Structure 1
Amino acid sequence: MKVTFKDVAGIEEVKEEVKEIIEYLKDPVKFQPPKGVLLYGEPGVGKTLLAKAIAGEAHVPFISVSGSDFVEMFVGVGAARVRDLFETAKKHAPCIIFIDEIDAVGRADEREQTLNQLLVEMDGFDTSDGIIVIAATNRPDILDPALLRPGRFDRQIFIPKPDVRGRYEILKVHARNKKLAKDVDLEFVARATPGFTGADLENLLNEAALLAARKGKEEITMEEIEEALDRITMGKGMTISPKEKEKIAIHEAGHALMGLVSDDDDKVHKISIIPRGKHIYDKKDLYNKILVLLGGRAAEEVFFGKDGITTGAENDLQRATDLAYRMVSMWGMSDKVGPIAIRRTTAVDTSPDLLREIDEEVKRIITEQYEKAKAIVEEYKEPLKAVVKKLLEKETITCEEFVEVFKLYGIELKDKCK
């Protein structure tokens, strides 16, 4: 029932980020200031596991609760439950309140009261009390922004799906209890499970142990590992085909290329075939953000043609369009429309002609930037092929490695590496 960082694998950056929280929990008054922390990511990537590991590293109790227990209760219950949860946590401090499925309470009627109670409690406890609240969710896109205001979950962390190195380390962690054979190559398993989560890998090793026992053996052999993987694939886990890997690699490479070419100030992050996940900007910065967002799809079209574009661009595309709309309907960055602003569902009833103008202008912006991105990808198609080769091999490369590959072709790129 004890958990520590030894049981978590493949997220060294997150461990570094939460080292401060662990130091705080070990001795709060000495440290003093994070209040709340949000963990978001697909199911089975280790959010609850990470919270429990943080709790165990500081040798503090771990209070686990779900939004589901608060959401469905009769009228007036959920708020008193939140308040009593915080009081019981205060009494056992120092401790951690873990709230899984925080989206169940924090969407953007009765749930509203419970949400407000949560906000009150988050703001009320001083740092002297010695509590840290960790929330977890699969749906960060539908969260009430109030939850992220300073003092309330003012620090968010993404837990990504594991790459090959992460998958290998996870397989090591979960192999420890099981008595595997010498022949098994967990590295091969890692390279054979792109798109798996830590939970998927646990289930794979467990099914392999089950099949081994069913065959009366005493050691788990590559036979059973491959059998379990084939079982799951043939009809829980979803694996990425090599063709899919190539498509994703090209999309992400186009994204990074646009990031590294645009006349912007945003820093380009690492390139990986794992899916990705309040300031002032000017018209040009926004055009270039759109460009970056359209880069992956532009690469898809340049390499595979109009019939090869994929759903992987979905997110990106939406954001791009959304941005264009804000540029036209909220920020008056269109000449044809002018410096008029309507949207905040809008507030005033708009005529159809004006909506048609807004739509036409959004299409103009998006298609212009899309042609720009397609042209850029065409110009640098060969260094991009090089990057994609390195990417399909290692599954992930650094922005610095991207720049290096590109200068190998006599191309100097902007120093935007994060």
Structure 2
Amino acid sequence: EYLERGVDVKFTDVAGLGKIRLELEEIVKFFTHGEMYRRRGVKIPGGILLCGPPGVGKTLLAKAVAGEAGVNFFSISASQFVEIYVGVGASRVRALYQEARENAPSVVFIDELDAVGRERGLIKGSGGQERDATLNQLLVSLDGFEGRGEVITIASTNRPDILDPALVRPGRFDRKIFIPKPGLIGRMEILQVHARKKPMAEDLDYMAVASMTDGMVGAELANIVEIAAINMMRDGRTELTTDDLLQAAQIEERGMLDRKDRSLETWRQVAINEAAMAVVAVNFPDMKNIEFLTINPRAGRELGYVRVKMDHIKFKEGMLSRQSILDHITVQLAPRAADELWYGEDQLSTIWAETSDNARSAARSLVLGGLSDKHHGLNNFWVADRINDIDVEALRILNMCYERAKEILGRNRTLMDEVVEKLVQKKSLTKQEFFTLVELYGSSKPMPPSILELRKIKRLELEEMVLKLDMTTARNSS
């Protein structure tokens, strides 16, 4: 009933494994070299749990490790265990573990334990009672009494925090393996292994494609492959090339490109907004690298957009400076000030009503996030005066950033005009031409010194003053 036929997935059919594959072949060793494991006085760990984002191929990983193990494979949905009546689920898991026991050697797979692995006492109902009964039955089948060494369970959950502490107790679910989002090389391998089944060209550098689809799951890479199969009848070309995959990545990243009737002043307004955004984005190190700048309307966003990719390591670790945030608010204050510099204060539009709210939210978050230097951070107080004064600093930072944005914008009026003319004329601008116009019409942008230069100057100053103390002690003593 719960048995499958025709399992042939191996480690070659799955891509982007890394050192996890090593752990995977450990399971193969657990299924092959087990006599040496047992002779060294070691109990076989029967519980492995794969945790990660959905779409990483948890079922594919289970199929691959089952095929490489060379044993019978069981894959069962956990939603079948939950029933409006109580009792059938415990019998189902008992019969499941029994047929797994008699089919030894074998490996079983149970996906989405979050339906049946919830805490006992979070919902008051008969369904919760059935869930508790099934959880206890699987608890007693896994470790409860002696008599199982050859059946190994495989678990695949997206939220490991809902797991019962009874299950993760040593002896039931001890091995925990995280399968993360693919980085760079995993995306190459997944795209290539999904693209073997389609005729493909030899000039196809997937590096740029994966450099566009940063931080996307393997199922999304399969989708990118899927938007590289049909759509070529409109032009009718010969072979799949780089630009087709680049456009497919652009489509799956933002949406379908649609053209509608429009006036000229609307295009001028949108291009002025995008021009302000890009011009202020140029003058800061936090978002200097600009790739695309367009004003074409898309699905869900009539307004234009800009693309920037600074290294994604500081955001994950949280090492962003205060100057990194105070600039960004200025960037989010780029559109409205441009309106004040182009149409007057009496004719402010309502297109920047979203970025201006982002600027004020970022200012409030920076104020109450400990980055403020009013007393020393201290985003919490007791008396009413200091709590009232907390919000005033957000307004002061907002006004300072708005004035800085206004000054920066007034510094670059010629670059403003040239890039806005190019935006209304071409509707899309790449990195090369935009940076060429920035070089032709830009002003001075003195970059503030980084951490290394400040460290070096402070180190030489410290050494010189400590050696000054050295002579002022020595020649005074000698």
Shorter-chain TM-score category?
0.5 to 0.7
The CA deviation at 1:27 is 5.0
Q: 1:87 to 1:381 in 2, by over 3 A?
A: farther
1:251 counterpart (287, 312, 315): 315
Q: 1:105 to 1:23 in 2, by over 3 A?
A: same
Deviations, residues 240-297 of structure 1 (Å, cap 9, x unaligned): x964755x43234xx4xxxxxxxxxxxxxxxxxxxxxxxxxxxxxxxxxxxxxxxx1x
Q: 1:115 to 1:135 in 2, by over 3 A?
A: same
Which structure 2 residues correspond to residues 45-194 of structure 1 after superposition, within 5 A?
45-108=56-119, 109=128, 110-124=130-144, 129-194=149-214
Aligned to 2:293: none
8 Å contact kept, 2:100–2:106: yes
Deviations, residues 183-208 of structure 1 (Å, cap 9, x unaligned): 32112212121011111111111220
Q: 1:234 to 1:25 in 2, by over 3 A?
A: same
Q: Percent identity?
A: 47
Which structure 2 residues correspond to residues 10-409 of structure 1 after superposition, within 5 A?
10-26=16-32, 28-32=34-38, 33-108=44-119, 109=128, 110-124=130-144, 129-212=149-232, 219-235=239-255, 243=308, 245-246=310-311, 248-252=312-316, 255=317, 296=318, 299=320, 301=322, 303-305=324-326, 382=451
Q: What SS class does the counterpart of residue 162 from structure 1 fall into?
A: coil
Q: What SS class does the counterpart of residue 134 from structure 1 fall into?
A: strand
Q: What SS class does the counterpart of residue 201 from structure 2 fall into?
A: coil
What residue ranges of structure 2 are gaps of 5+ in the alignment?
Answer: 1-6, 39-43, 120-127, 257-305, 330-358, 370-381, 383-448, 460-478
The CA deviation at 1:232 is 1.2
Q: What SS class does the counterpart of residue 203 from structure 2 fall into?
A: coil
Aligned to 1:391: none
Output the amino acid matched with 1:303. Answer: S
8 Å contact kept, 2:49–2:175: yes
Q: What SS class does the counterpart of residue 141 from structure 1 fall into?
A: helix
Query: Higher relative contact order at CA 8 Å, sep ≥6: structure 1 or structure 2?
Result: 1
The CA deviation at 1:381 is 5.8
Q: TM-score, normalised by structure 2?
A: 0.52
Q: What SS class does the counterpart of residue 135 from structure 1 fall into?
A: strand
Q: What SS class does the counterpart of residue 148 from structure 1 fall into?
A: coil
Output the amino acid matched with 1:51. Answer: A
Output the amino acid matched with 2:117. Answer: G
Equivalents in 1 of 2:453, 2:195: separation in Å? 38
The CA deviation at 1:150 is 0.8
Equivalents in 1 of 2:143, 2:149: separation in Å? 12
Q: 1:242 to 1:36 in 2, by over 3 A?
A: farther
8 Å contact kept, 2:208–2:246: no
The CA deviation at 1:37 is 0.4
The CA deviation at 1:64 is 0.6
Output the amino acid matched with 1:143. Answer: L
8 Å contact kept, 2:94–2:137: yes
8 Å contact kept, 1:175–1:205: yes
Equivalents in 2 of 1:11, 1:102: separation in Å? 23
The CA deviation at 1:31 is 3.0
Length, aligned pairs only: 275
What residue ranges of structure 1 are gaps of 5+ in the alignment?
Answer: 256-295, 318-355, 357-379, 386-405, 411-418
Identify the range of structure 1 (18-27 vs 32-41) with the bigger mean alpha-carbon deviation: 18-27
Q: 1:382 to 1:72 in 2, by over 3 A?
A: farther
Equivalents in 2 of 1:19, 1:42: separation in Å? 22
Aligned to 1:286: none
Q: What SS class does the counterpart of residue 8 from structure 1 fall into?
A: coil
CA RMSD of aligned residues (A): 3.4
